[PDB]
Each structure stands twice: as C-alpha cells, then as structure tokens.
Amino acid sequence: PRQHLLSLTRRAQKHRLRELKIQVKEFADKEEGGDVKAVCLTLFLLALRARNEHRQADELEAIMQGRGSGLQPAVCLAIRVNTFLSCSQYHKMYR
C-alpha cells in the first residue's frame, strides 16, 4: 500500500526513484558535461521558483555557495585564533 513519497526511508526512496535517477544521470552526462548535482539543484531551483518562493531559492543559493547558516573553515579558523581559543576549548565549544 502506497502512503507518501517522503514517508519512506532512504533505501526505500532510492529503490523507488532508481529509474528517474538513471534517466537524469544519463541525460545529463550525454550533453551537459556530467555534473549531476548541477542539473539537480538547477531543476530544483526552477521548480521552486515556479511557486515564486524567492526566499527558499535564495537560502538554498546561500547554503550551496557558503555564505549563511554555516561557516567556511577559514572564518572559523580566524575566530578560533583571534579569540585566543585553544584546540580543546574550541572542541568543547564545537561539541
């Protein structure tokens, strides 16, 4: 009995979308170079802007570009150094 897509587990969702996975990967590496993740997030942003949710698309662009809700290692290194944090104290703080 079918219930819903996101109600399944990871392996079950993979079993259910293996066909679309193969199709998208082949039709993306035929002509579009082969970057599967690129075509994936591009199609997702397009389907999301179809619902004109500018906010969600901007947040996803920020996440996938590293500029919000998550720091690149250089910035947190500068924070760990310029604030005189130790390696164990930063660890506790990060733990």
Added chain:
DNA sequence: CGGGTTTTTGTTAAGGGCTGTATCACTGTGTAAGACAGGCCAGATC
C-alpha cells in the same frame, strides 16, 4: 482464517571518505618567619 498482490527492510562482498575517540608525554596551582640549642664574652663577685 490463507493465495495474490503490494510496498518496506535487510544482506553480502569490497572499497572511499568524514567524524569521533583513545593515546602520547607533560604542566600549574600547593613558596617567610619563628623556635631552639649551643657557643661565647662582659661583668658582678667572695
């Protein structure tokens, strides 16, 4: 109360990559004065 049928859930093997944890040899905080026995000279003395 089971077949027929369907959607979830493991299961093996080998390799890759990110995350967490044990291990090594060490540290910094326990830090100033007083009690007492022995020697010794200045001096009252009988």
